[PDB]
Write a protein that binds this DNA or RNA. Sequence first.
RNA 1: AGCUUUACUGCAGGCUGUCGCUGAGGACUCUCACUCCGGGAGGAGGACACCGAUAGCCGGGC
RNA 2: GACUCGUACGGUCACUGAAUCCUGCCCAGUGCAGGUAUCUGAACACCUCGUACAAGAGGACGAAGGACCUGUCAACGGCGG
RNA 3: GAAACAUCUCAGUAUCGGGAGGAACAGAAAACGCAACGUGAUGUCGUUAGUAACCGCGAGUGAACGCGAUACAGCCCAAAC
Lengths: 92, 237, 56, 194
Amino acid sequence: MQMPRRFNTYCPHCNEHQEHEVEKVRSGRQTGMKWIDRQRERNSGIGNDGKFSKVPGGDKPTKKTDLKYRCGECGKAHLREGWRAGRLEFQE
Amino acid sequence: GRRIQGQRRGRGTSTFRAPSHRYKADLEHRKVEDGDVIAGTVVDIEHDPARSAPVAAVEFEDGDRRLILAPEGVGVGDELQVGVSAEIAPGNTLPLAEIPEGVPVCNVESSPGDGGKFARASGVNAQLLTHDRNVAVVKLPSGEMKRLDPQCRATIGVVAGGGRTDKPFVKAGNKHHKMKARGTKWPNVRGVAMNAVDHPFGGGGRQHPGKPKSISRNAPPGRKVGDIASKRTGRGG
Amino acid sequence: TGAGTPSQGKKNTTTHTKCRRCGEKSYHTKKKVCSSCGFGKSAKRRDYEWQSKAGE
Amino acid sequence: ARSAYSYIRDAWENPGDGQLAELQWQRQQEWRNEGAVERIERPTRLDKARSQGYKAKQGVIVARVSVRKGSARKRRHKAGRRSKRQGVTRITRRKDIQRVAEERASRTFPNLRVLNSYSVGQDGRQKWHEVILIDPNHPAIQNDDDLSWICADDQADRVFRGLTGAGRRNRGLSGKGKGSEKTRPSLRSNGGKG
RNA sequence: AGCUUUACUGCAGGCUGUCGCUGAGGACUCUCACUCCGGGAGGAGGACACCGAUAGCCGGGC
RNA sequence: GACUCGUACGGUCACUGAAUCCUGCCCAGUGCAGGUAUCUGAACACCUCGUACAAGAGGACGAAGGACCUGUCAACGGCGG
RNA sequence: GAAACAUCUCAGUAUCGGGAGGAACAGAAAACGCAACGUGAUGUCGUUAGUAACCGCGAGUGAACGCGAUACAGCCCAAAC
Ligand SMILES: [Cl-]
Ligand SMILES: [Cl-]
Ligand SMILES: [Cl-]
Ligand SMILES: [Cl-]
Ligand SMILES: [K+]
Ligand SMILES: [Mg+2]
Ligand SMILES: [Mg+2]
Ligand SMILES: [Mg+2]
Ligand SMILES: [Mg+2]
Ligand SMILES: [Mg+2]
Ligand SMILES: [Mg+2]
Ligand SMILES: [Mg+2]
Ligand SMILES: [Mg+2]
Ligand SMILES: [Mg+2]
Ligand SMILES: [Mg+2]
Ligand SMILES: [Mg+2]
Ligand SMILES: [Mg+2]
Ligand SMILES: [Mg+2]
Ligand SMILES: [Mg+2]
Ligand SMILES: [Mg+2]
Ligand SMILES: [Mg+2]
Ligand SMILES: [Mg+2]
Ligand SMILES: [Mg+2]
Ligand SMILES: [Mg+2]
Ligand code: NA
Ligand code: NA
Ligand code: NA
Ligand code: NA
Ligand code: NA
Ligand code: NA
Ligand code: NA
Ligand code: NA
Ligand code: NA
Ligand code: NA
Ligand code: NA
C-alpha cells in the first residue's frame, strides 16, 4: 500500500495533535557485549553447543509494518502497532 | 563399520609381515675408510628370497664374507672392487663421481653412505647422465631424473635376473608360492564383493562402487580406497 | 563339523593350572599369568571393585 | 647490600635476555641429550633452591626432570559418547607439567621425598624443572631443625598425594577465602568439583 | 541395534596460515639451534622441517 | 611400528576376471586432479575508531579451499522425446 | 531424567591408575567485606537456604560471608647483618 511521508496525528509526548513523519526502523548494529554475547562465548565448547548450535528460523509470507513516528515539533518519536503489508511506499 | 583391510595391515601382525627370519642378507654397500684398496673374490651365486633374483657371495681382502647385490654377468672367481679408485667394470662399486657418464648403474645411494637405495629389482638399472663438481644426474628406472650427490656410491651394470616379469604365473598356485615369500596378504577380495560394513564399496544388490572411485588425498585412512588422488583415469584421451 | 559335541574331542590342551602364588587353578601355563590373583603380571594382587556391588 | 643470590634471581626474571639467555641456548643442547631424570650436584638456580628449602648438606638431592609440552596425550573414544565427551584434541590434564615432573623424579628415588621444585626453562617441545628431594633416613637430616619435619611417616609419598608446594597450588588451595569453596580442605571431600 | 547418505550435530584425520622452538646479514644470502646421512672425520639440509598451540577448508573414517 | 634383510622388472590402492574377436559416443551433473587475471576466503601481526586500559566496530593484506577455467569415463554414471 | 534429543541431567557417580595414616586432608590471611570505631588459623555439626548464582532461562542445578556450637595453638625458613 501507499502511505503519507508526513501527516497530522496524536503525539503521546506533546499530548496534542501535530505533524509527524514516518520512517522505517533501520536495524541498529550490535556491540556483541550484551550478556547473551558473553554466555555464547562462555558456554560454547567441545561438541554440540546447545542453544548456540541452532540456526536462523524462517519468514512469514508477509511481514508487519515496522515504523517510527516522529513528532514535527519536539522531534520525539513514538511506536505503533504494525499491520501486515507486502509492500509499503511513502508518498512524498 | 569395521576397519577395512588396509587398516589391519598397519598393525603389523603375522599375516601381513615378511618372513624376515627366512631372508638372507640386507644387501648394502661395503664401507672403506678411503683409498679403495678393497676388493674381494666372488665365491658363490645364491638365490635371494627377498627379491626373487640372484645375489653373489664375496670374500674380501680383509677376510670379510658378505652377500652382494649382483649385477648381470658376475660369475664365481670374478674379482670385484669397492672404492674411489675401483676399476670401471661391471660389478665394481664406486662413487658416481668416478663413474663415466652413459654407463648403466644399479643399487644407487640416496645419501652417500646409505649403502644403496635405488634400482635393485630384477634387471632394472639407473643411468648416469650428467657430471658436475656438485650434482650427478641419474635417470632412475621409473624414468625420473634424480639429482644426486656425486659422492653417492653405486654399482656398475644392471641388476641380475632381468626379464623375470616376462613369464606369466599362469596358475594361482604359482602366485601363492611367490606371495608366501613377501610381506603381503594374498589372495585379494574386491571391496565391491564385500559387505557395506567391511569396505566403502561394499553392499548393494549387485556389485558396483557406491561412489566415484577417485578419492581425495586428504581422505582419512579407512576411507581412502580405489583410485587414490588420481590425476585422471582410463586410457582414452 | 558341529561346533558342539564333535568339536569337544580335541580339547586335551592344558592351560589353567594350580597357581604357585594364590593356590587357585588359574595359572595359565602357556601365558605364565594367573587369571585369579594376577601372579606373573602384577606384583600386587589382582582385585577389582566390580567384584562386588558398588555400595559394598 | 644486595646478596650474591639476588643476582642469580634477577637474571632469571628474564631467561631470554643477556648472559642467562646465551647460557640456556647452550645447556639445553646437552639437556636435550640427557635423560628423563638427571641427578645434578648443584642447583642451576641457587637462590630459588635455597629459597625453597635447599641446603648444601647430606641427604639433600637435586634432579632435573624433563616433561613434554602441550595438552593431554589422549586416545579417542572406542564406544558410545555423547558429543560432549567425544573430545580428544582440546582436552588437557588437571595436573600441571611441573607436578608431573615432581612425580617422575620421586619415582626415580623411591627412598627420598619431594621437598620442592622449580622451573629451569623449556625449549620448543619440552619443559625442564629441577626437583629438590630429601633423604628422610639420613641422620644429617633427622637432626636438621629445618627439615626433620619431612621425616614423619605421614610425609611418606607426599608428592603422590599432592602435599607438595606446586601440588597444593595446583589443587586450588592458594586462596583462603572466595573461590576456594570447592577446594579446601580437600578436592575429594568437596565431591571433585574444584 | 546393524547399515546408508549431499538428514541433524559433532569427533578423529588430511591440507593450509599463524605463534613458539627461532639465529646472522616481498624477494634473498648465511650458520649456530633443530633434522637427516656418515664408524669417524665429515656431508646434506637449515631457521624451514619436526614438535607444541591456534585458525580456515575438506572430513559417515567414526 | 608393519610394508621392509624390500626399492618402480618394486608394492601400495582399486576395478575387470583364462583364451578368442573386440571394447563405440558423452566431461553437462558428481568425483579426482591441474591452473587461475579477477571474485570469495580465518586467526596472529598491522592501520582507524572506540575505551586514561579493555570489551567492541571497521580497514588493509590474503593461505589452503571455493567461484571460474582445463584434464579425465577400463571414475560414479549416461547413451532419450 | 528432560516424557524425543544435542547443552543440561544421571555425575565428577560407576569403574580405572598412584599413594598415606590410625585417622587422613586442612591450617595461622596478599582472609572476611552483617562496610565497620567490625571479625580474626583450620576442620566439622546446626543454621544461613533451596537463599544468591547457573540453566534449550526448559527440565533441572546450587554455594558463601555471618550466626549458634564442637575443639582450640601457634610457629619455622629464604634474605638483610
Ligand atoms: Cl515497514
Ligand atoms: Cl608378485
Ligand atoms: Cl614424595
Ligand atoms: Cl564479621
Ligand atoms: K547423555
Ligand atoms: Mg562446540
Ligand atoms: Mg635391507
Ligand atoms: Mg601383473
Ligand atoms: Mg605370508
Ligand atoms: Mg579378486
Ligand atoms: Mg555377500
Ligand atoms: Mg561405510
Ligand atoms: Mg560384476
Ligand atoms: Mg561390476
Ligand atoms: Mg561357536
Ligand atoms: Mg574432611
Ligand atoms: Mg536405532
Ligand atoms: Mg637415523
Ligand atoms: Mg552413523
Ligand atoms: Mg566371479
Ligand atoms: Mg529422555
Ligand atoms: Mg523439553
Ligand atoms: Mg552439578
Ligand atoms: Mg564469601
Ligand atoms: Na564458566
Ligand atoms: Na555397492
Ligand atoms: Na620417593
Ligand atoms: Na571448579
Ligand atoms: Na541389527
Ligand atoms: Na561429467
Ligand atoms: Na567433470
Ligand atoms: Na521420556
Ligand atoms: Na529415543
Ligand atoms: Na543448560
Ligand atoms: Na549479627
